[PDB]
């Protein structure tokens with residue numbers, strides 16, 4: 058197999074987001090696509106490597122809850138093509154336009170996000186940057202995990218503390234997931250009463266700060282609230298893995314009207 | 315670079331349908347999945363080849379309007395795993411529960427079907443059995459093209475019916491089938507409903523004596539679309555347009 062797209066097939070439309078790791082456009086290639094591009098003439102050795110690394114990961118994935126990789130181009134410039142999601146990121150819903158979902162729906166969104174992560178961890182893919190802004194709510198129904206991009210609020214202590222050359226683990230992604238659950242159940246970002254990034258870093262690293270779980274919706278089930286607490290445990294080893302998380306959600310999910 | 319699924323991760327659930335080209339079960343592998351598996355002790359060389367061809371083809375696809383292939387196992391038995399689709403086929407909507415879609419959507423369904431078919435043909439895949447029961451309307455708003463078995467004469471081009479050649483299939487026979495599907499969308503009906511004899515339909519379509527009655531299209535089906543249908547249904551292969559042209563024609567009247 059080979060997913061190279063011949064040149065002059067992709068038409069590039071309106072810009073969507075810009076930053077030196079690439080530029081994202083809405084484009085046309087057998088319908089609507091998203092197109093990530095490097096905006097330079099001659100790319101560096103570090104950018105070329107990371108492109109092959111991104112594509113190497115994406116082509117290993119085929120699942121409804123993961124943004125569908127469609128192809129790449131290098132011919133005119135470096136480019137990665139994916140499906141074009143209609144809708145909004147979770148972040149956009151929760152913190153910009155402030156959509157208020159029914160509890161039944163919030164739990165579904167959670168289940169799907171968990172479903173997708175289960176798949177990645179089964180493939181030995183660690184996401185490293187899961188957060189509400191990299192979860193799209195496709196056609197207002199299906200979750201698509203992607204990477205639309207540091208992001209401190211979703212970072213586990215052992216990552217914040219660094220120290221270790223590789224603090225990332227399935228359990229770090231679980232912690233990130235735990236902060237997403239917090240966003241879903243409270244409709245808010247954590248540590249909203251603190252306006253200083255350095256302190257948040259220092260305090261989370263040291264264990265003096267945790268998300269305030271009393272801010273959860275009144276109709277958020279106890280079972281869910283306990284799942285949060287376990288995902289957000291300050292110690293890696295106590296955090297559950299996605300198979301158990303998934304099972305957990307599905308038990309309290311069916312236990313509802 | 316490989317898609318094999320280790321033994322015993324798939325839970326085969328309820329049986330959906332079963333012909334001698336495999337059996338389709340609803341299953342569980344990282345969520346709801348469809349599982350088409352051969353139900354035999356020991357596969358024969360040409361069964362083993364059909365499997366490899368089907369897997370070979372599915373793994374060439376990554377497009378929103380094509381059924382998402384997820385993996386295969388040969389471990390306990392030969393099997394192919396795809397996404398599970400929610401809802402029902404276009405055939406079922408049009409001819410069974412007789413769903414009344416607005417024209418806005420019928421055209422949208424036409425567009426998506428064309429979108430996926432252009433993808434296939436760009437990848438050099440000829441479908442060979444395009445028809446409304448092979449078009450799933452997923453969550454009631456996305457077209458998923460595939461094979462949803464459990465032959466089919468109403469979608470066959472004249473050159474296919476005649477069967478003069480070892481291989482009469484082309485990009486243009488897929489276009490004709492698409493053309494018949496446009497007829498279903500735009501009329502709610504199967505073609506040739508006034509004729510109760512299968513061999514006669516076979517004969518006359520083959521000969522050019524019979525073709526779909528375009529006057530049965532709904533009154534608000536725009537003239538561009540009737541005209542488009544007519545070109546897809548032409549009896550000479552070479553006079554039928556290819557898919558980029560179809561996609562372009564539909565995208566034109568869509569926006570207006």
Ligand SMILES: N#Cc1c(Oc2ccc(F)c(NC(=O)Cc3cccc(C(F)(F)F)c3)c2)ccc2nc(NC(=O)C3CC3)sc12
Pocket residue numbers: 073074081091092093111114115118123124137138139140141142143144145177182184202203204205
């Ligand atoms: N921005 C944006 C954007 C978008 O971004 C792209 C585009 C191309 C890409 F290659 C990527 N890269 C990845 O995600 C790859 C990746 C990296 C790390 C881990 C993983 C994994 F999860 F798979 F492990 C995957 C992201 C995609 C669709 C899309 N649709 C939009 N629609 C709207 O805004 C309008 C409707 C309102 S915006 C938009």
Ligand SMILES: N#Cc1c(Oc2ccc(F)c(NC(=O)Cc3cccc(C(F)(F)F)c3)c2)ccc2nc(NC(=O)C3CC3)sc12
Pocket residue numbers: 330331338348349350368371372375380381394395396397398399400401402434439441459460461462463464
């Ligand atoms: N039957 C079924 C079925 C299903 O079938 C599978 C399963 C595995 C496979 F390998 C295939 N193989 C192909 O499609 C092969 C192919 C041939 C020609 C061209 C092309 C291509 F277009 F891809 F090129 C591909 C088909 C998939 C989902 C699904 N969901 C359902 N839901 C319900 O029953 C309703 C109650 C809710 S039934 C169902």
